[PDB]
Design a protein around this ligand. Structure first.
Ligand SMILES: Nc1ccn([C@@H]2O[C@H](COP(=O)(O)O)[C@@H](O)[C@H]2O)c(=O)n1
Ligand SMILES: [Ca+2]
Ligand SMILES: [Ca+2]
Lengths: 341, 330
């Protein structure tokens, strides 16, 4: 057992994006493997490790790991104290004094964690930073199947985070967003079948909307601590259905004009599914996030859907199939070669 | 650090399926987290734990776990002694005496492990049991393994690696696919046979990996990836030929390919998300890879590969859907 002692402050009672700052620090520290104790006056109980947090803080990092004596800091400011079990031998019933003594006996290295000290002044800033911590990027401490591609990071998350901000104050769940997003991909696919510029343009727009909103399920999951194994599985599975059905619809319409597009469609669908499969099979076999260093063809899902959108607005959905088939199949083969080392 | 002391025996020098019995017990005990010491006369070094093996044995368990002092037995026969660090406080330079003493101070429980005591008599039996200890579905396990183990038995005494088998297996699937493209009953029949051969041989990579301690993460990744390529290319080849007679088969082929890929994806995504093997506890539609290839083989021998596409498209898509619903609880 590891104990996290958190000193009470009235500001913890304030709600930030659907949860009190109190439950936020509680849930983050629990995820980090600590039993939490809020206190006005500290009474020390037995544990292997002690984490002490005196000033009100919002922890933004996702995968906090605490091994060995350290002082936790955020931009030079002390966030909390991580003391060893031997703190018992020092504690004299006065917290202020006992910390002073323990620090004089030890030479604690400072350790940087992503956090923001809470004040009545800067909650708007806390909100902005909390939202920014929801993206799938190694910078946040998250450890997903794989991280956001460049389009996701610089285009799509900018929009979806603003949607998630509004959803945070509702009862909407991640699984509901995942299913709704899947449904949107079906609407887009149906629009392709109507075989006209107007509906093809609309299909493209709705597919890019789908791409954006598909980021909200993960954002809300992380934002309200509603992540689940099934949720991660379902989101991946339905994204595969979406990718296939979108290509199927475009291919089906085009095949009336030239049967050669069945071949291109087959290859585009295969490529789309295999970019996802090579990544998830990596996680399955290696038990770590898939995240290659250096060169890689940008043909992850955020790119594929943007390409479908762009080609659709100029009424050339056929071109999207060609690009995905080419780029996607080359990237899959490249991944095979690159991973051997 | 934990030390495994293994008494020398001439029988350890004999090769069993590509490795000496010495190398086998060494690698098994290393995998289990022990540093190995072969000995005629025992000299004790410092460690948290001691494992002592006096009689020549082949250990068949792959994930051996030793927590707390025990006597290791196989069908009542003592395989080895697992003593605590305090054995140091007892050891007097004579192994026989020290074991007697340590056992009189302790009341060790017996712990059952899968192993076989080695003699010049039962090495044929050792080979059979070792092959049997090497672990896509019920067809794979209960039909195909009967043939693949016999192939793996022969490959074990060569330098062939799991990755080489995986790539050769992939190549066979391409040969089968090419045969479908030639569009005649004879070549469709041959395609079916080669696809089932591919199914059988594809299990050899895992057998050889475990048998020769050559498992790797990349090997597991590569087999899965190339199996997806194979499933797609086989269906593509059948569909392409059929599309000449009726374009509706493009649709069925599309659905058969998707189904094949999604059965694999739902399974591997499960491992990625849950960090456990995917294994339903009750009913499931039998449409894992071993079944799919058998269906293609069977339909091909009566010149109806089109029926294989319909069956895979139907069973595979329903099974994917079933998994979605079922896992909402699991
Ligand atoms: N229904 C959902 C959707 C996403 N998630 C979480 O979000 C991750 C995916 O993030 P994105 O949706 O932002 O790409 C999943 O792997 C899982 O950790 C979830 O837990 N339940
Ligand atoms: Ca999503
Ligand atoms: Ca396989």
């Amino acid at each position: 057992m590891r104990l996290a002692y958190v000193k009470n402050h009235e500001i913890y009672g304030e709600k930030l994006l659907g949860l009190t700052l109190r439950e936020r620090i509680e849930k983050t520290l629990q995820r980090a493997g600590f039993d939490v104790r809020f206190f006005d006056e500290l009474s020390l109980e037995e544990a292997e490790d002690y984490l002490i947090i005196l000033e009100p803080v919002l922890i933004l990092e996702r995968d906090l790991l605490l091994e060995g004596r350290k002082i936790l800091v955020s931009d030079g400011f002390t966030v909390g104290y991580f003391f060893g079990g031997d703190f018992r031998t020092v504690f004299d019933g006065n917290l202020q004094s006992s910390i002073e003594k323990y620090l004089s006996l030890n030479n604690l290295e400072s350790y940087e964690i992503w956090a923001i000290k809470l004040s009545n002044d800067n909650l708007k800033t806390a909100e902005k930073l909390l939202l920014s911590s929801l993206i799938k990027a190694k910078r946040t401490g998250l450890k997903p199947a794989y991280y956001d591609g460049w389009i996701a990071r610089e285009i799509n998350r900018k929009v979806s985070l603003r949607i998630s901000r509004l959803l945070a104050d509702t009862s909407v769940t991640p699984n509901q967003i995942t299913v709704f997003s899947f449904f949107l991909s079906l609407v887009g696919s149906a629009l392709f079948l109507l075989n006209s510029y107007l509906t093809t343009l609309l299909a493209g727009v709705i597919i890019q909307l789908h791409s954006i909103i598909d980021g909200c399920d993960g954002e809300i999951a992380r934002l309200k601590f509603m992540e689940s194994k099934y949720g991660a599985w379902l989101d991946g599975v339905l994204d595969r259905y979406s990718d296939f059905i979108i290509v199927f619809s475009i291919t089906y319409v085009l095949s009336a004009s030239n049967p050669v597009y069945w071949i291109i469609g087959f290859l585009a669908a295969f490529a789309s599914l295999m970019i996802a499969y090579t990544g998830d099979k990596f996680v399955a076999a290696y038990m770590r996030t898939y995240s290659p260093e250096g060169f890689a063809i940008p043909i992850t899902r955020d790119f594929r859907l943007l390409i479908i959108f762009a080609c659709s607005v100029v009424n050339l959905p056929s071109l999207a199939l060609v690009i995905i088939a080419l780029l996607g199949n080359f990237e899959a083969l490249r991944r095979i070669v690159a991973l051997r080392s």
